[PDB]
Design a protein around this ligand. Structure first.
Ligand SMILES: Cc1ccc(C(F)(F)F)cc1Nc1nc(C(=O)NS(=O)(=O)N2CCCOCC2)co1
Ligand SMILES: Nc1ncnc2c1ncn2[C@@H]1O[C@H](COP(=O)(O)OP(=O)(O)O)[C@@H](O)[C@H]1O
Ligand SMILES: [Mg+2]
Length: 472
């Protein structure tokens, strides 16, 4: 315990906030097993012991916020006090898959001091819980054929071999492991898991959506009026089960209240919501952000060093302006406030009017772990090429380029309609487009409707597309 106390102290300092006190704005999330699940009992059997737990969650659903909340509660003695002597937080986006490294090196880097008692930490592996946050955010490729597997926590291995050996339970077999990932990445992960317990993060319930708006707005009057807009807008109310969406919408309505204009948000698509957020912050640095984003996705870079920023014309003062308006975050290293914003600007890179800009090359890499699957680049590309879309940002886009891309997207649907993209995913893309002329032609390529629904947003998106089928 001599060093455990020093470590828990360091954990309560880093994970005190979400970077805003974590306990202040944290709002209970909904978890379901494989029924409601309780944190303390997460590693209890039914049977063999449960060493691996997998958290499936949508982008922005709150995987990282929940991992940080667990670090904090445990460090405070509220959670797993009797179970684990150590929790180590592994931020997958920082772990190179190429650099040779030892599990000891990895543990030591989670520690505050340079010379920790690593050999003591490892004496009781069953008392360790590894928290891998954002498996999908590993940069580069990653497949089940990796090998050979390592059984020595001191031996240095390529990052991919290291993580594979850890996930397969070859390294420290009886240590516990908690992985958070987006569902799409389970294609790769599933073949390594050993008797996993799968949990699903569902986000905010209707009552928790209200709670968030009230925790966000110090003034109750603002909270209740901001939430009234949501209640009135079927699409936003439904979409606000994603906590990230709650934060985007709340931050936007905040500006309107500072401007004094009567509150009103009429967004109908995710693209509309993300455009409503950026416009509220307002044009000179527009090209720079899209270049950086497109480069980051193509070359697998989430974290951007100052050399990359100056490389794309973003001077140090320009970056300080993004931090002020909460469009950038520093973590030396800079990154986008969320990966979805990096895909949004990457999509816009193909539509700006004066990395390759040939959309056909982009679509060839769709759904590949190596590039990050490109799920939201395509969704945002469908919504941005929408002719009906109008805004100060629409003028920066090229009508000619939008037309060429609109035509290629349609050829793309025709092939896929006759693996990823599923039919439901294409419904999300078509829902972003909205244009009935486009959607009606696209919907005719499908021989049959074949979908599986889980959420209200699934129902809404698929109802919109079914209604736009031809009727004899
Ligand atoms: C940020 C956001 C805004 C608005 C909406 C809403 F409008 F929809 F509410 C949803 C989200 N979040 C989100 N995350 C994923 C996500 O990560 N999906 S995925 O990659 O796992 N996938 C499912 C597995 C099969 O492949 C298809 C792709 C999809 O949507
Ligand atoms: N439980 C929560 N309470 C309050 N805000 C949340 C919560 N979960 C997510 N958020 C919001 O989402 C953002 C980060 O989401 P994140 O945890 O990174 O989701 P993911 O890791 O699944 O993308 C934060 O800025 C925060 O405002
Ligand atoms: Mg995350």
């Amino acid at each position: 315990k001599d060093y455990r106390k020093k470590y828990r102290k360091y954990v309560r300092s880093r994970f005190q906030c979400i970077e805003v006190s974590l306990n202040k704005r944290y709002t209970r999330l909904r978890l379901i097993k494989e029924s409601p699940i309780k944190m303390e009992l997460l590693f209890d059997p039914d049977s063999e012991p449960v060493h691996t737990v997998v958290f499936q969650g949508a982008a922005g659903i709150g995987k990282t916020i929940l991992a940080r909340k667990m670090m904090l509660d445990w460090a405070s003695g509220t959670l797993y006090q009797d179970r684990f002597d150590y929790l180590f937080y592994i931020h997958c986006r920082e772990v190179s898959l190429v650099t040779q490294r030892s599990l000891g090196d990895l543990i030591m880097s989670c520690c505050p001091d340079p010379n920790p008692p690593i050999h003591k930490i490892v004496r009781k592996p069953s008392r360790i819980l590894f928290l891998m946050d954002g498996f999908d955010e590993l940069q580069g490729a990653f497949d089940e054929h990796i090998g050979p597997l390592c059984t020595d926590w001191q031996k240095a291995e390529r990052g991919d071999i290291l993580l594979s050996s850890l996930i397969r339970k070859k390294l420290l077999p009886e240590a516990s492991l908690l992985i958070t990932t987006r569902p799409v990445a389970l294609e790769k992960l599933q073949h390594l898991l050993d008797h996993p317990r799968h949990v699903e993060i569902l986000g905010f319930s209707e009552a928790k959506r209200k709670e968030y708006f009230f925790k966000y707005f110090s003034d109750e009057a603002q909270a209740r009026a901001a939430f009234s807009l949501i209640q009135e807008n079927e699409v936003l109310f439904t979409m606000c089960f994603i906590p990230l969406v709650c934060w985007i919408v709340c931050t936007g309505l905040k500006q309107q209240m500072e401007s004094g204009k009567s509150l009103a948000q009429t967004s109908k698509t995710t693209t509309a919501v993300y455009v409503f957020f950026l416009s509220s912050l307002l044009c000179a640095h527009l090209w720079g952000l899209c270049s950086l984003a497109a480069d980051g996705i193509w070359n697998q870079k989430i974290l951007f060093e100052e050399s990359d920023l100056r490389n794309h014309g973003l001077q140090k003062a320009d970056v300080s302006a993004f931090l002020r308006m909460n469009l950038f975050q520093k973590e030396k290293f800079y990154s986008f406030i969320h990966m979805t914003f990096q895909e949004f600007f990457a999509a816009m890179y193909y539509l700006l009017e004066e990395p390759s800009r040939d959309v056909t090359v982009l679509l060839e890499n769709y759904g590949k772990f190596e590039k990050g699957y490109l799920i939201f680049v395509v969704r945002f590309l469908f919504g941005l090429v929408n002719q009906e879309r109008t805004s100060y940002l629409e003028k920066k886009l090229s009508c000619k380029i939008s037309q060429q891309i609109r035509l290629e997207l349609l050829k793309w649907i025709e092939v896929k309609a006759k693996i990823q993209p599923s039919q439901l995913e294409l419904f999300y893309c078509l829902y972003e487009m909205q244009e009935e002329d486009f959607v009606q032609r696209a919907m005719d390529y499908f021989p049959k409707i074949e979908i599986n629904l889980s959420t209200r947003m699934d129902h809404m998106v698929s109802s919109f597309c079914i209604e736009n089928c031809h009727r004899v």
